[PDB]
Amino acid sequence: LKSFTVEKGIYQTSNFRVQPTESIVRFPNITNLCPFDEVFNATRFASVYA
Amino acid sequence: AENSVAYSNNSIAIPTNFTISVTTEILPVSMTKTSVDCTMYICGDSTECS
Numbered sequence: 900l901k902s903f904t905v906e907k908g909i910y911q912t913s914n915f916r917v918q919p920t921e922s923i924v925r926f927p928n929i930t931n932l933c934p935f936d937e938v939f940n941a942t943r944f945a946s947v948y949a
Numbered sequence: 950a951e952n953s954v955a956y957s958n959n960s961i962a963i964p965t966n967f968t969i970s971v972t973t974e975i976l977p978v979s980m981t982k983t984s985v986d987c988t989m990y991i992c993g994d995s996t997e998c999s
């Protein structure tokens with residue numbers, strides 16, 4: 900009511916209570932993974948000039 | 950429907966019988982009472998918009 904004196908009756912009050920919120924991020928399943936291990940666990944490596 | 954009252958300056962028409970008619974009248978009185986909130990309608994669960 901923006902006042903220090905409240906008369907008799909029933910009043911509707913705006914929200915002044917503060918609650919804390921967290922952050923939830925959901926993303927799909929990790930799949931079709933990079934075959935970089937095939938780059939890494941190769942028995943022989945690529946040649947210098949090819 | 951077209952009507953023509955048989956008017957002359959010595960003739961009158963007097964009813965000899967009656968009827969009792971109970972008719973219906975419908976009147977609105979009040980309507981729906983509604984109430985609104987600022988932050989819940991406009992922004993809604995948003996601190997920076999509030």
Ligand SMILES: *[C@@H]1O[C@H](CO)[C@@H](O[C@@H]2O[C@H](CO)[C@@H](O[C@@H]3O[C@H](CO[C@H]4O[C@H](CO)[C@@H](O)[C@H](O)[C@@H]4O)[C@@H](O)[C@H](O[C@H]4O[C@H](CO)[C@@H](O)[C@H](O)[C@@H]4O)[C@@H]3O)[C@H](O)[C@H]2NC(C)=O)[C@H](O)[C@H]1NC(C)=O
Binds near residue numbers: 965966967
């Ligand atoms: C002034 O007006 C009033 C009413 O408007 C008359 O008073 C009586 O009216 C009733 C209803 O018309 C008469 O009763 C009987 O009506 C039967 C028809 O009934 C149908 O319609 C009524 C509504 O009007 C519905 O509620 C009902 O469900 C039916 O759908 C007739 O079939 C009757 O006729 C039988 O009886 C007479 C004797 O009375 C026989 O001669 C016939 O052959 C038949 O067997 C009957 O008419 C009632 O009779 C009226 N009273 C009198 C005293 O006649 C007034 O008559 C009228 N005039 C004056 C001067 O007051």
Ligand SMILES: *[C@@H]1O[C@H](CO)[C@@H](O)[C@H](O)[C@H]1NC(C)=O
Binds near residue numbers: 936937
């Ligand atoms: C590649 O080597 C690493 C380390 O030993 C191992 O964890 C991984 O499973 C290997 N990948 C493949 C495809 O063999």
